[PDB]
């Protein structure tokens with residue numbers, strides 16, 4: 633089939649987190665924005681309309697929404713208000729998402745395992761891991 637849609641579509645709620653504060657600190661986020669954003673723990677929604685995929689946070693201070701096609705670079709405005717160039721691709725059934733800005737780079741992997749969606753964020757040496765369940 634084209635089984636990526638069934639694996640990823642839905643509303644996902646955070647259930648665990650490691651080193652996200654560190655990851656945000658590395659990305660440049662300030663001390664107040666980090667703490668609040670880290671507590672916010674928004675649900676994240678994935679939808680699909682043809683070739684166009686959309687990832688939205690539910691309402692949180694610092695709403696976000698991207699809409700993209702696999703392989704096509706696109707401008708994104710992150711939750712900490714960075715203007716980045718993002719490319720997302722499907723490699724192994726993992727969604728790999730690279731953001732470039734100011735000669736810097738961060739990679740965000742999103743993979744299904746069992747009934748769970750695991751999100752790994754890497755910036756320089758600093759690796760964050762967050763796990764989500766269907767809400």
Ligand SMILES: Cc1c(Cl)cccc1OCc1cc(=O)n2nc(-c3ccccc3)nc2[nH]1
Nearest residue numbers: 644656669676678687711712740751762764
């Ligand atoms: C929020 C944020 C801040 Cl303040 C700063 C830097 C990066 C951020 O986001 C990075 C980031 C964090 C995170 O928990 N997830 N969770 C998803 C997700 C989960 C399920 C379904 C679809 C997407 N995508 C991400 N990417």
